[PDB]
């Protein structure tokens, strides 16, 4: 395609402090090194310039950050990974004229052993039912890696477009993630069905785990 597209790999880099981090940025066509920059962003703050013109550290950037590459592939390398380095990293194309563009990003996170989620399903409270809406909440607790699939089933009917998820940041003690999914239904439609299941698929599970309940029982 005609336009410039920066594709970063891997989408998620899982390492421990002290290891070497190799982040890649692939351009849809050849790019001069002058027009490539690297950024770091920690959750809740603005991005920070790491490298400019492909290889040059910005003011105040420690020595462990370095860049390499040419043409269509450029690399950001972190030699001795520090705990402060776990964040999101973007590459940018900033040529002699706009438009500029960024890569989709690479999340550098803490590596740990694979742990399966403990799944819980919560029926809607009677307090909420007295308002006209029914929220069914499913909990995925302390799992790793972050890649998890949550499928809602109402009377064995796979749901779609009526749920919302959110994931916590990587825990500071056990380095796991947690996930919460809410299935929203009107109170009337909620009284028309029986089985409400939360089917979870994760790398730590040899087969999908289903947490369900029967309305009324």
């Amino acid at each position: 395609v005609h336009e410039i597209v920066l594709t970063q790999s891997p989408g998620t880099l899982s390492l421990s402090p002290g290891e070497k981090a190799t982040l890649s940025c692939r351009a849809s066509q050849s790019i001069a090194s002058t027009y490539l920059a690297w950024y770091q962003q920690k959750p809740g703050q603005a991005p920070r310039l790491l490298l400019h013109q492909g290889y040059n550290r910005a003011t105040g950037i420690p020595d462990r950050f370095s860049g390499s590459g040419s043409g269509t592939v450029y690399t950001l390398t972190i030699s001795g990974l520090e705990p402060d380095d776990f964040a999101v990293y973007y590459c940018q194309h900033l040529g002699t004229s706009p438009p500029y563009t960024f890569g989709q990003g690479t999340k550098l996170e803490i590596k740990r052993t694979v742990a399966a989620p403990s799944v819980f399903i919560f029926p809607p409270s009677d307090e909420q039912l007295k308002s006209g809406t029914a929220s069914v909440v499913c909990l995925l607790n302390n799992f790793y890696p972050r890649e998890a699939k949550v499928q809602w089933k109402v009377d064995n009917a796979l749901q779609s477009g009526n749920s919302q998820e959110s994931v916590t940041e990587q825990d500071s003690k056990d380095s796991t993630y947690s996930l919460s999914s809410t299935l929203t239904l009107s109170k009337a439609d909620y009284e028309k069905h029986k089985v409400y299941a939360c089917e979870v698929t994760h790398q730590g599970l040899s087969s999908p785990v289903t947490k369900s309940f029967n309305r009324g029982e």
Binding site: A46, N56, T59, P98, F122, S135, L139, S180
Partner: protein, 223 residues
């Protein structure tokens, strides 16, 4: 000590106009070398960075293709400010907006040739809702158990959730809130607890939403 201070309204109803202004401190609009680049960057929730537009030292203005019909980037020389105007705002425009400083890549072979100075940004949320206190619903537990609270239908952010007035911290997971299709936020906070103590221990979540002056204590008992 070059800094950027950004100000503007972030809580917008659909079809209204986003108006943000960025103030320059420590540098002139053009710079000494006539090389300053004043850009606007957008970052939707959980997504990557998106460049919006740029007005340079000489006044030339370029927009991103997807926003060129609705964006107006300008600058006030005498006040050392530059602004971003985005009209007809919808839910797709919900994001944190930044202004940054760049330097033109002319005479590249001889400081920083990127976005080296960023402002603290502005969280822009597009919702038709007004200030509303939340409703707290229990997530009753049915050898490790889990219970929690459901903080639903409030606006705007944020809310403070505590368990037993801060006495219970181990095993607590307060998830990031999500913006429902109604324009109201919804949040859940959970905690994992040994199953044997469900009959003796008592658990009560403390929800505080200071925008609406709402402080709700809701205890969660077994079913």
């Amino acid at each position: 000590q070059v800094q950027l201070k950004q100000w503007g309204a972030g809580l917008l109803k659909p079809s209204e106009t986003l108006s943000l202004t960025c103030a320059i401190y420590g540098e002139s609009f053009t710079g000494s070398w006539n090389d300053q680049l004043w850009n606007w960057i957008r970052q939707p929730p959980g997504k990557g960075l998106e460049w919006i537009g740029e007005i340079n030292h000489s006044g030339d203005i370029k927009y991103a293709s997807s926003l060129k019909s609705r964006a107006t980037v300008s600058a006030d020389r005498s006040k050392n400010q530059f602004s971003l105007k985005l009209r007809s705002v919808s839910g797709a425009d919900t994001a944190t907006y930044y202004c940054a400083r760049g330097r033109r890549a002319v005479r590249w072979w001889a400081a920083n040739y990127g976005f080296d100075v960023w402002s603290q940004g502005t969280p822009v949320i597009v919702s038709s809702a007004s200030t509303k206190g939340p409703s707290v619903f229990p997530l009753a537990p049915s050898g490790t158990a889990a219970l929690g609270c459901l903080v639903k239908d409030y606006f705007p952010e944020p809310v403070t959730v505590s368990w037993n007035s801060g006495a219970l911290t181990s095993g607590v997971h307060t998830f990031p809130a999500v913006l429902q299709s109604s324009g109201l936020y919804s949040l859940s906070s959970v905690v994992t607890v040994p199953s044997s103590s469900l009959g003796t221990q008592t658990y009560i979540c403390n929800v505080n939403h200071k925008p609406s002056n709402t402080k709700v204590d809701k205890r969660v008992e077994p079913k």
